[PDB]
């Protein structure tokens, strides 16, 4: 019943998580100077819609055509999901052996790879 807090702990202590980056403007400003492969941040969906079934975390990264983001959700029992932001349908993500950040890193960087190869 408390596994959500352990998943949040794993995300929020990681250096990729940027607690002071909230708006789209701040994301653009961040990647103006940063060479980081991706960031994690507090998603807009937390204050936006739904009625408290997930805690929402967004990833952001930059390719040659601009900034791309991915929305993730954690449910009350600690399960991870990728979230389609246009339909809000969820898709479960199984945690890789080395843990949650190891999982998100693979989901984000492989997705960035698909984007870059299509450009």
């Amino acid at each position: 019943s408390e596994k959500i807090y352990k998943v949040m702990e794993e995300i929020f202590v990681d250096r990729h998580y940027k607690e002071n980056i909230r708006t789209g403007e701040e994301v653009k400003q961040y990647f103006s100077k940063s060479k980081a492969e991706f960031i994690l941040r507090w998603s807009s969906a937390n204050e936006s819609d739904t009625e408290n079934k997930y805690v929402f975390i967004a990833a952001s990264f930059q390719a040659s055509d601009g900034i791309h983001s991915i929305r993730y959700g954690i449910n009350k029992n600690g399960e991870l999901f990728s979230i389609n932001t246009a339909s809000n349908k969820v898709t479960p993500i199984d945690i890789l052996p080395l843990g949650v950040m190891a999982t998100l890193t693979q989901h984000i960087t492989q997705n960035k790879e698909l984007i870059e190869k299509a450009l």
Partner: peptide, 7 residues
């Protein structure tokens, strides 16, 4: 923000 959406 442009999001990566699958389904």
């Amino acid at each position: 923000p442009s999001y990566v959406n699958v389904q």
